[PDB]
Design a protein around this ligand. Structure first.
Ligand SMILES: [Yb+3]
Ligand SMILES: [Yb+3]
Ligand SMILES: [Yb+3]
Ligand SMILES: [Yb+3]
Ligand SMILES: [Yb+3]
Ligand SMILES: [Yb+3]
Ligand SMILES: [Yb+3]
Ligand SMILES: [Yb+3]
Lengths: 705, 702
C-alpha cells in the first residue's frame, strides 16, 4: 500500500525501527558476548579521526577512514565454518539500496572507498576488526549490530545504545568531497572552535570574538536535530551541497520554524538583542530545549550559528565580512541616490541603502554539479533576500564563478555577485519629473571583503577572490559575462575633485568632518556644497538627519580649499542606534558647469571595551577566578545591564544582571571557572543594557596540564 | 526606519496606498474613457476579450487607447500632464511598481509612453504603450497635473484598475510565441485533455482549465499574494512559475492542493473526481486554506490554469513509465531471487504507469543561448537539491542534451525520462549480482494534446534521443558529468509477453512466448507475478502467481497462454484499475535471467452526456447525464460531477446508491454564455468505483 510510495520517507535520524534478533526462513554458530569500539578520548580511533575533541561519550568517526573494534565471542572464531558481518543502520526505514542499512562484510583486504572490514587479530574468543567507511557515507548517528549467519537465516545482537557510532565528514580524507589539502587550514576551518567577527566600517575595522563551540556538550546532537526538524531525507545527508543548501535555510525562522528570529528593530521585545550573544552554544541549545525559534539574530549571529553547524559536522567553513554591501540587489548592479535640483540628496526618493558591513559564510567542498574548476569555497548567505525562489538564503554559490561573472551556475549567483560588485549612481530628480545621472562611484561597494586569518586574530583580505581590480579588462569582462547571464544593469552609465575625511570619534566626543576641494583646472569656480549627517542602523537605514549644513566655496585655479566642520556631541547623542553609526552625504554643485560632485562615508563611534582578567591557576581541572569589569562611559545611568561571559573549554556561557550603574561608575564580576580544555583558550564578555549596547571584550588565556 | 529595510516589502497586489490629490495650477480632468467593453478595439486587439471581467485588460508591450476629458482644452503651451500607474502599498518608480507615463511625440520600442493621437473640444485621445518587461498584475490609474506649485492628481477610482498581463504576441516579450495556432492552443484554449492509462492502452480525459471564467484571473494573483511574491518579480515568467509551482502542492496548510493517494480520502474530494481547475481555485480563494485532495494530473491542471490565465503559453505533458523520486539516480532496482523470483521484500522502488507535469514557454536569459523555449515544470514534489519540492523550470533542450548543470532541478527531471531498470539477484548469502538491464522501459512515450483537436501528440523526441544512438549515449555521458548518478557497474532465447485488455469484470488472457535462435535446446523455468497497483506502481497485493517450466528445442517458438479470471482480481481493485504483470525466467543450462514486465488498466465504461434544447447563447439548454452501474454490486454514495466552461459552472449531485446494473439519469438546464465549439464534461466518484468520465462536444450559437 502507500499509494504515493511503498515505504514512507526515511528522514529522521532519531526515529528507529527494531531489527529482529532472529529471523530464519525455511544453535551454536557463534554468538557475541561483547563489542569493543576503542572510543576513549586518549584511544586510537578518536584521536586518529580528529574527533577526540568532542565532549561526547559514543564513538565518533569520520567517513572514508578505517577504525577499530573488537568482537568478543562465546567461542573462537573459525574462518572455516563461522560467518558474520557488522551492521550499521539509520532511521525508521533502513534500506541498503539507499545507504541507510549497511552490511560491512569481513574482507581479505580493504578497498578504495568501499565498506569492508579486514580481520586483523584473533585471540581466544575475540576478533579485532579494522572497519572502513565509504568516503560518500551519510552523516549522522548510526546503530550497530553484529549478525551471525546461519544457513537458515540470521541471529543478530540487540539494541545497545552504547555502541551507536557517529560518522562525520572527512576533511582529512582524499576522497571526501569536503577534502582539504593541508593541516593548517583543516585545523583552522574545522578544528578551531573560536573565531573573530569583523564589523564597523572599512576605515576603522572593528573585531570581536565569537564562540563556535562545536565541541561543547549537546551541540553535535543539536545539529542532527536541526536536520531532523527540517525533515531532511537521510539519503541526502552525505551531500555537502544539500547539507549547506538545507541547513542554511533553517537558520532564519521564516514565521516560526527555523533557529533564529531576525530582528533589526533596536527594541527586541521578548528576546535577546543580537548584539548580546557571545557565541553559538546558547542559541543552538536553547533552540533544542524549546524546539522553537530563538529570538533574535542579525546577519553575524546567523553566520556564527551556521558556521558552528558546518564545522561541527565536518565541513570546512569560515565567516566573511563585506564592506559596503548591496543587500537586496535583486541582481541589479546599481544603487540609486536621488538629488534635488539644487544639489541636495532627495531624502524621500532614496530608499535603497548600502550596509556598512554584512557577513556571510563560506564552506569548502567540491562541485560535481558544475563544470570543472568551480570547487573550493562556496558562498552561502543565510540572511535572506529575494532570489529566484524568492526571499531565502542564497548559495552555495561558487566563489570562483562569482569572480568571473559566470552567474548561470547554481546556486543564487547573481545575488552574491551584485552584493559585492555593483555601482552607486547619482541621479537628479527634476521638479518636472525627469531624471539624469550625474556620476557613478564604481569603487564604494565591495571595497573590502575580509576574514580571520589562519595564524591568529588578524584579518585576511579576500577581496581578490570575489572580484578582480575595478578598472581592468578582467573586472570589466566578468562584469559583461554576468550581464548576459542575467545580471541587471538598468541605467546606461569639470575637473574639480573633492573628498572628505571624517575623524573617527569616541562615544560622547565632538569631532570633525574635513572636506577638501581641489580646483584642478585653470578657472575660478563657485560651488555650493551641502553636508547631510544622519544617524543610522548598520544596514544603512537612516533614523534621522541630525545635522544639515550648506556652504559656498570660491576655488582658485590649480589650487585647493579645505573646509572643516565640527560635530558637537550634543547634536547626535540623544538618538544614536546600537552600533553607534553615522552616515555623511557631501554633495557640491559647481554653478558654472552644473557638474555635481557627491561623496558619502560612514563612521562608527568607538566605545571602550570590557576588561577581563584572570586570577587563579591556568591548569585544566584547577580553579581560576575570572574578573569582568565594565565602566559606564556615559554621563547617565545604565539600567538592567546584562553582562555576559563565555569561552568554550573554560566555562559555559553565563550572564549576570546589574539593576543599574551610575555614570562613570564601574562594576566587577568575579567568577570562578574550572578550565576543562588545555592550551590557548580565550574568554569572551559582552554587554547590553536598555541604553548602551554592542560593547564587547576578550582575554587570551594559556591553560595547561 | 524599519532597521532591516527602509520601506516594507511590496508583495501584495491587493494592498493599496491612498495617493494625495495635491502634493505641493490649471487643467482638471472630468473623466477618462478606456475602451474596455469586450467588443472594442482594446480587448479585441489585445486578445483579452474572453475574461468574464468588466475592467480593462491589456497585454504588456503593446499599445492601447484611452481618452481624458479636461475642464478646458489641453494646450501644449502651458499644460503638463502624465498618466500614472501604481501597484501595491509601497510603490517605487525605481522598482517598476510606479509607472509615470509621459507624453511623447513618438513611441520608442520597449519603453512606457503615451502618444497624443488626437485632440478635440477639451479631450485628448491617447495611445499608451507599456514596457514589454512590465510587472503583471492589477494596476491603479491616476492622472497627474504638474503645476508650478506641485502636482494635482485624480482620486481613487476602481473602475479604471487595469490588469496588464504577459503577451506572447509581442516579439519583445520573453513569452513571445511565433505562431498564432500555438498561441490559440497554448493560451486561448480553456479546455484541455489529459492522457493517462498505460503506454499500450492510452486513456484520454477532458479538463476544464477555465482561465476566462468569472474570478480566475483574480484568484491567480491571489495565489501570488498568498506566496508573498515581490511585485517586481511578477514580470518574470521564470520566477512566476518557480514560485507558482511551489504553491500548488500544499506543504502543510500552505499551498492550494493537499496531495493524497490513500484510496480512502477521509475528508475531501477524491482526486479522480475533479473535472477542471475552476472550483478548486475558487474553493481555495474562499476557504483561504488548502483544498483536499489532489494528484499529479490535478496539480498539472490547476497550474496550467495559473500560467494561461496570466499569459504564459503552458501545456500538460504525460510521461509513460516515469521514474519519479529518482534522487538523480539513473537506475531502478528490481531484485531477483536466486531461482529467478521477484523479491518483493527488497524491491520497494516503483515506476509510475504514467506521470503528468507542466511545460511553460519562455526564454531563459539566465542561461546560455539555445536553452530558451519549452521549460519542464513539475509541481508534484520529489527530493531535489532543495529537498522535497516542485522541480522548477528546467530547459527541455538541456534535458535532451545532458546539460544538467543548468538550473532549475534539471537532473531530477532528466532522470524521470532516462533511468534504466537493473535486474539484480540478491544471493542468499548476502551477495548481489546484476543479471540484466532494461534500457527501454522508462519514458517509453511522452505525449501532449495535438494543436488541432483532442488528439495525441508524441513529443518524446523533444526530451530525448533514441535509446541506442550516439547523441543519446553522449547526453547520458554528459549528464553523468554534472551529477546524475549511475551507482551499479553494468542465450539468444527471446521472451516477451502479450496481455489482452479486458473490461472491468471480464476474464482475460496473457500469452507468453519464447523464441530460441540458438542451434540447441534449453530448459526455461518461468514465473508470473501479477499484482494489483496504484498508477504509481506501488502494489496493493499479488493476486496471482504461476511458475512455468519450458523446454525449447532449437530454433523453436513456443507460446503458452495463461488466463486471468475476473474473480481473481475483482475483490481488490484500486481506483484506476491498474494491474502489474511480471515475468521472470532462467535458462537452467546457462543460468541466464530473462525478465519482462507490463501493465494494463481495466476499461472502465464511459458516462453518457446528451443535450436537448436551444443551442444558442442565453438560450436555455438541457443537459442529460446518465450512468449505468456496470457492477454486480451496490454503489454507495455516488457523486456525479457536471462541468463545461462557457456552458455551465461546475456542479455535482449525490445518489444514495445505485442498484446493480441499473441506470440513473441527471437532468439540468444550462444557459451557455459562450458560443463556438464547446464542451460539457462529467465524472463519477462513489465510495467504491471511481475514475469514470464522460464528455460531450456541443457547439453553441450566436
Ligand atoms: Yb509557519
Ligand atoms: Yb506551523
Ligand atoms: Yb564595480
Ligand atoms: Yb565593477
Ligand atoms: Yb505551516
Ligand atoms: Yb501556519
Ligand atoms: Yb538511456
Ligand atoms: Yb507447464
Amino acid at each position: 500500500f502507500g499509494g504515493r510510495r511503498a515505504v514512507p520517507p526515511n528522514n529522521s535520524n532519531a526515529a528507529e525501527d527494531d531489527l529482529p534478533t532472529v529471523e530464519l526462513q525455511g544453535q551454536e554458530f557463534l554468538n557475541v558476548t561483547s563489542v569493543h569500539l576503542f572510543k576513549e578520548r586518549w584511544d586510537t580511533n578518536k584521536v586518529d579521526h580528529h574527533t577526540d575533541k568532542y565532549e561526547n561519550n559514543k564513538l565518533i568517526v569520520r567517513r572514508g577512514q578505517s577504525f577499530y573494534v573488537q568482537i568478543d565471542f562465546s567461542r573462537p572464531y573459525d574462518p572455516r565454518r563461522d560467518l558474520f558481518r557488522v551492521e550499521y543502520v539509520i532511521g525508521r526505514y533502513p534500506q541498503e539500496n539507499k545507504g541507510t542499512y549497511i552490511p560491512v562484510p569481513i574482507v581479505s583486504e580493504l578497498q578504495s572507498g568501499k565498506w569492508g572490514a579486514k580481520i586483523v587479530m584473533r585471540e581466544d574468543r575475540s576478533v579485532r576488526l579494522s572497519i572502513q567507511s565509504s568516503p560518500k557515507c551519510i552523516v549522522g548517528k548510526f546503530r550497530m549490530y553484529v549478525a551471525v549467519w546461519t544457513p537458515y537465516g540470521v541471529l543478530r545482537t540487540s539494541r545497545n545504545p552504547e555502541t551507536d557510532t557517529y560518522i562525520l565528514f572527512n576533511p582529512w580524507c582524499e576522497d571526501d568531497a569536503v577534502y582539504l589539502d593541508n593541516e593548517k587550514e583543516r585545523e583552522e576551518y574545522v578544528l578551531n572552535d573560536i573565531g573573530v567577527i569583523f564589523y564597523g566600517e572599512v576605515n576603522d575595522i572593528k573585531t570581536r570574538s565569537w564562540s563556535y563551540g562545536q565541541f561543547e556538550d549537546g551541540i553535535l546532537d543539536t545539529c542532527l536535530y536541526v536536520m531532523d526538524r527540517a525533515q531532511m531525507d537521510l539519503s541526502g545527508r552525505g551531500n555537502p551541497i544539500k547539507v549547506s543548501r538545507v541547513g542554511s535555510a533553517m537558520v532564519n525562522a521564516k514565521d516560526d520554524e527555523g533557529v533564529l528570529v531576525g530582528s533589526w528593530d533596536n527594541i527586541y521585545a521578548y528576546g535577546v538583542p543580537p548584539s548580546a550573544w557571545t557565541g553559538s552554544v546558547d542559541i543552538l541549545l536553547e533552540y533544542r530545549s524549546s524546539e522553537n525559534p530563538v529570538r533574535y539574530g542579525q546577519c553575524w549571529v546567523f553566520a556564527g550559528v551556521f558556521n558552528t553547524f558546518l564545522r561541527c559536522l565536518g565541513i570546512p567553513a569560515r565567516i566573511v565580512t563585506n564592506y559596503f554591501s548591496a543587500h537586496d540587489n535583486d541582481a541589479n548592479l546599481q544603487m540609486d541616490i536621488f538629488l534635488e535640483e539644487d544639489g541636495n540628496v532627495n531624502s524621500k526618493l532614496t530608499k535603497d541603502s548600502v550596509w556598512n558591513y554584512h557577513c556571510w559564510n563560506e564552506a569548502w567542498m567540491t562541485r560535481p554539479d558544475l563544470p570543472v574548476g568551480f570547487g573550493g569555497w562556496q558562498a552561502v548567505d543565510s540572511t535572506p533576500q529575494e532570489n529566484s525562489d524568492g526571499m531565502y538564503r542564497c548559495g552555495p554559490a561558487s566563489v570562483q564563478a562569482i569572480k568571473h561573472g559566470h552567474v548561470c551556475f547554481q546556486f543564487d549567483a547573481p545575488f552574491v555577485f551584485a552584493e559585492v560588485n555593483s555601482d552607486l549612481i547619482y541621479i537628479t530628480a527634476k521638479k518636472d519629473g525627469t531624471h539624469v545621472v550625474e556620476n557613478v562611484d564604481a569603487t564604494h561597494i565591495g571595497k573590502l571583503i575580509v576574514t580571520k586569518q589562519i595564524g591568529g586574530d588578524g584579518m585576511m583580505d579576500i577581496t581578490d577572490t570575489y572580484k578582480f581590480q575595478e578598472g581592468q579588462e578582467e573586472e570589466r569582462l566578468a562584469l559583461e559575462t554576468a550581464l548576459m547571464y542575467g545580471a541587471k544593469k538598468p541605467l546606461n552609465t569639470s575637473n574639480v575633485d573633492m573628498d572628505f575625511e571624517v575623524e573617527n570619534a569616541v562615544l560622547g566626543k565632538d569631532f570633525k568632518l574635513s572636506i577638501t576641494f581641489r580646483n584642478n583646472s585653470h578657472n575660478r569656480y563657485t560651488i555650493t556644497a551641502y553636508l547631510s549627517a544622519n544617524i543610522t542602523f548598520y544596514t544603512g537605514v537612516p533614523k534621522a538627519e541630525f545635522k544639515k549644513e550648506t556652504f559656498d566655496v570660491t576655488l582658485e585655479p590649480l589650487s585647493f580649499k579645505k573646509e572643516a566642520v565640527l560635530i558637537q556631541a550634543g547634536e547626535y547623542m540623544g538618538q544614536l542606534l546600537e552600533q553607534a553609526s553615522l552616515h555623511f552625504f557631501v554633495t557640491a554643485r559647481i554653478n558654472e558647469t552644473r557638474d555635481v560632485l557627491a561623496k558619502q562615508k560612514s563612521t562608527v563611534l568607538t566605545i571602550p571595551e570590557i576588561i577581563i582578567k584572570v586570577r587563579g591557576t591556568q591548569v585544566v581541572g584547577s580553579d581560576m577566578t575570572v574578573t569582568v569589569e565594565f565602566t559606564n562611559p556615559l554621563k547617565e545611568t545604565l539600567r538592567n545591564v546584562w553582562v555576559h561571559l563565555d569561552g568554550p573549554g573554560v566555562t559555559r556561557p553565563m550572564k549576570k544582571m546589574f539593576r543599574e550603574i551610575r555614570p562613570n561608575s564601574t562594576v566587577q564580576w568575579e567568577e570562578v571557572c574550572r578550565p576543562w580544555v588545555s592550551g590557548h583558550r580565550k574568554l569572551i564578555a559582552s554587554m547590553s543594557s536598555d541604553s548602551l549596547r554592542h560593547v564587547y571584550g576578550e582575554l587570551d588565556v594559556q591553560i595547561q596540564r
